[PDB]
Design a binder for this molecule. Sequence first.
Ligand SMILES: Cc1cc2nc3c(=O)[nH]c(=O)nc-3n(C[C@H](O)[C@H](O)[C@H](O)COP(=O)(O)OP(=O)(O)OC[C@H]3O[C@@H](n4cnc5c(N)ncnc54)[C@H](O)[C@@H]3O)c2cc1C
Ligand SMILES: Cc1cc2nc3c(=O)[nH]c(=O)nc-3n(C[C@H](O)[C@H](O)[C@H](O)COP(=O)(O)OP(=O)(O)OC[C@H]3O[C@@H](n4cnc5c(N)ncnc54)[C@H](O)[C@@H]3O)c2cc1C
Lengths: 591, 598
Amino acid sequence: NPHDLAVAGILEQLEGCLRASDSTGAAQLFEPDGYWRDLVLFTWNLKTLEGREQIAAMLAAQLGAVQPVSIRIADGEHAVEAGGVLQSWITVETNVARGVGFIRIRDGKIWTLLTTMSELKGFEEAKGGRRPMGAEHSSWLEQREQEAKELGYARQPYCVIIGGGQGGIALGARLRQLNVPTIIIEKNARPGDSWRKRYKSLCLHDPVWYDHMPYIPFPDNWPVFTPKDKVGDWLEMYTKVMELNYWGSTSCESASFDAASGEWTVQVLRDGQPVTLKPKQLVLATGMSGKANMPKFKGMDVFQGEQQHSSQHPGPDAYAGKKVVVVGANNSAHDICAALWEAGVDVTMVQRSSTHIVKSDSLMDLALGDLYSERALAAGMTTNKADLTFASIPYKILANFQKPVFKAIRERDADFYARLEERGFMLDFGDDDSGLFMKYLRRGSGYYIDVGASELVAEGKIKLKSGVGVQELKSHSIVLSDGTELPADLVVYATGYGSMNGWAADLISPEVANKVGKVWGLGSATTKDPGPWEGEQRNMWKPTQQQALWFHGGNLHQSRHYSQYLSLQLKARMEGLNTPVYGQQEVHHLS
Amino acid sequence: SNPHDLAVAGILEQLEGCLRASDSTGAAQLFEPDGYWRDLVLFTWNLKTLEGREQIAAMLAAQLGAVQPVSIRIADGEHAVEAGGVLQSWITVETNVARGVGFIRIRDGKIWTLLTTMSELKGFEEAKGGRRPMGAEHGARTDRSSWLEQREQEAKELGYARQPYCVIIGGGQGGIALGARLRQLNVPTIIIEKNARPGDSWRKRYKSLCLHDPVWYDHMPYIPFPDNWPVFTPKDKVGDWLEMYTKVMELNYWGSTSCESASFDAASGEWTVQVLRDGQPVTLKPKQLVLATGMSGKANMPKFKGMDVFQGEQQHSSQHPGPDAYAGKKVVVVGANNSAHDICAALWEAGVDVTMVQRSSTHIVKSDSLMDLALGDLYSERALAAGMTTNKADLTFASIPYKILANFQKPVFKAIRERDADFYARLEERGFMLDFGDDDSGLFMKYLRRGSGYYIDVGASELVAEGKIKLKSGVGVQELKSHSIVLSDGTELPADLVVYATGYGSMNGWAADLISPEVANKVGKVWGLGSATTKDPGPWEGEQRNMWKPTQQQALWFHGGNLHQSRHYSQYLSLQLKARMEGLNTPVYGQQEVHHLS
Ligand SMILES: Cc1cc2nc3c(=O)[nH]c(=O)nc-3n(C[C@H](O)[C@H](O)[C@H](O)COP(=O)(O)OP(=O)(O)OC[C@H]3O[C@@H](n4cnc5c(N)ncnc54)[C@H](O)[C@@H]3O)c2cc1C
Ligand SMILES: Cc1cc2nc3c(=O)[nH]c(=O)nc-3n(C[C@H](O)[C@H](O)[C@H](O)COP(=O)(O)OP(=O)(O)OC[C@H]3O[C@@H](n4cnc5c(N)ncnc54)[C@H](O)[C@@H]3O)c2cc1C
């Protein structure tokens, strides 16, 4: 291929500079403002180097310790040319690891480079050609019962994960494949209960092609949008067959770290019994959403009806013939209001701030179609290549990729949007018009994927009062800042959640929560994501300022992909490897 | 272009030309005089191999009116290849009611072998890929019934207020696979299984047991084992997998339910099946009954002199719980088959005095050698890397007519013998009686012909070859005395326990005990090819007797086989069941007549 020669020569110069510990020379091969996003392989971190000077500074600090380095076109792949961009899958090696990557080249200059870590040399996963035999040509069940009785009691785990939802289960499967002895702590009774507990009608709003767990993808006949209990069944059965050590009915009560011994002391209550676990690494996988935001409205003590945060709302059944006011317009607000109307309960939504609304069909086609769809698969974009393609766009410029996508969504769904506005609903498209994904990555909230509620709003079936605040709650009403008085038997506060940092404050200490800082967000200086720029998700899947404390989570996509780089970092430290973190992120917000 | 594509595509259009022309004799003229057309449902509504031009013409003359118009072409995205004078190509075939994949071999301008299969019924395709269910019903409703509610409704109504179309007896690997395929075709089906949980059929075996077939060969439909799954799966890990598979594939699986009896009423077209679901009687009235109770039938119990005199324990291999109770005892196992080898190796690991007593020869193959030389080309990592997917692997194997399979296998097992020659020499020198099939065609051919007579060695044969398991061969049982067993060479073995590892009768014995001896006789022997070899008498039948296809008893079907055959032939059985559920015209051609009652 005519492009293979072009890309391979650029890669050879890069390879030459990297072997020579020539940081400046390597950076000169990039565009002046080019990007190098590294996932563990060079930085022992999740780090995006922006521009030649940052690129050179990383290479000057890391190259001496990783030699010899190779980088070349990936086996079986070829370079392609689109829109003036030369791109190719690549393979990259250090002295202790290998990985795949992706490179984009323009006018002979590296525009973007992705390096990732796939495996640690000598600790490769027993997959494919390396499969365990299973049988020798003490039984398999006996050994499992041995591990169930000894791990966490007579013998301590290397790693403890708090939280057995989708995120901890995926991370646990990955850790199991790396022989990192691990216990998952889950206060629910069974795996999958994290999803069973939602409202009757809930389904995933992300599509199947985007949603796979590691190792066992959903089958070709699995539904596009999975009902909440069908997810539960899958997670429970995934947990069994991937041989996880999963302590259900077990609450984590407290944890602390002793830098002297390098050990945590984690106090749990397993079916009522106190147990003390002493792992070397602690992972919080308690959900990206932390502590509920409770408003401080005048007269909340005067109101004689029920007040619930959206997280304490059981559903519409108890409220036939009653009147509900939902304070909020996020997706929790839309879910709760659509259920109350389907049940024939009087519901009013009170919106103070704008919301980004996207029709499910439009999100699936225009925003996910290129990477996660039947069309994507037929074109060869496998789930792994999709994850790596998305990861290869530096967060700095992703909004630029996204803007045309969500402009097309507005033109397609314009009539839908007009009717929402004519009704008085406050629309936005992210602070910079870059859309749903960027809001999710920046603030983890502020959007609703419409599966039926927005039409109920446009048609007036869900009553809307927007543009107003709450003045006070009276004895049987809530009074809005324009003077409107809404009678209310039940007030639901759909006011969101703080960051995961609240989990650390509640389980470790507020002092440790302060060391760690706000979790999630990019530092984009937009709503609920204050600057300055950090360029990677705050405290996710990477070293934190609290030693041996980690955060895992995200949506099913991010949990699938970044559980790989988190587990490889946990494994590397279990093997006593040298892991010199570059550019460890300084804390700019205590929450 | 491809120069082989043109040759094959021209041969195929002549075939298609003749078929649209209702030219049975002319279409047959396109095969070698003795060519083969193996059909899986698509043309014959049967599993049927047409052998020779006269049979081909007769089938085509009988069926063509029922399946026209027929299209047959090279498969989309595939190309013909030529090797050793043989032209091959994947093909795609459509009828007026169905579509499917096929495979064609051509030599000197004549069709040597044709494989036609049915993949789907037109208008009843599976909800997969582009046709996935949405799962969620978007848009507001007040009559909303959630996924969990509908599932709880079906559990409560099916078999009570509403009868299933099909009932499967047996919830092992075979019934679970078939159940999955039937749920994908919206054939309401109840699995009846007397064990408590799905997967218990594997949990029930001895501690150390693993699959002796490798993972690449073993997948269940729809959810393959993952890339980190072990080659040889321990039995309890197989149990957990089936238990998860049954849950996530939405099977209606009545555990703790024994099937007591069933009878068919040709007037109503209904079965009456009496079950005990947790002790409580239920009466099920399906239109179709599938027996999936395992290929092994009634245990064969020997008639030895003095069995009534022996003062120790006597067990059939199927009644032997394991070595635990026999710490200080002396065991004699009468048999040298696979049950006997498993039981003896377990007794020897536990330090029990065990002697194996062999009368007839056994075929021994090392698990590792089966994996490389017998399965390596189709079911391996190298096969996958070469584009041979599990389904392409299944179709390639199915594309070899059974009449010629034995000669493909002979060089495979000549190679296995040369590789393991010292192993075999030490077994023969120790006095173990070896064979390699009646015509030296090896393990897979015995299995297809008689379903017995072999043991895949995972460690026990070395214990025999080295004398750790004591061997007495070439002998029968003369009599049991009060505390000993006497062999036909005069040896008197002291014995606390005698295990009779003497195999099983045919699967139709299940039909005898659950339906009636008359129905069992009408159905006849199950399994076997009619190969005129040991335990497989002629005449030649060419397909597994009564497997995955219509039987001489109306609305009675048999499902089973190894994980490979269950995976693959459950597709054709479920489609035949689905076609009848939708009231399609299904004219069976060449329905096999019974030549043996058992
Ligand atoms: C309508 C709707 C649709 C959605 N669709 C999708 C979708 O398609 N894809 C997607 O990725 N997300 C979707 N989400 C979001 C989904 O809720 C989260 O993404 C999901 O919960 C992932 O969270 P997690 O596994 O990281 O943590 P969680 O799901 O919150 O689980 C964390 C677990 O930690 C446990 N826990 C907490 N504290 C303790 C303690 N002290 N001791 C022990 N255990 C503890 C909890 O019981 C919980 O089970 C949807 C949400 C809604 C409302
Ligand atoms: C060491 C060893 C290794 C093996 N490895 C393999 C391998 O790798 N691959 C392979 O394919 N095979 C293997 N086998 C063979 C295996 O035992 C059978 O192939 C397997 O059981 C398939 O049978 P099945 O699921 O069709 O029926 P079965 O497993 O026999 O199950 C039929 C079920 O029907 C139930 N049943 C019977 N009567 C009734 C009734 N009246 N009411 C309700 N339920 C009833 C039984 O409880 C049983 O669970 C191995 C065997 C051994 C000993």
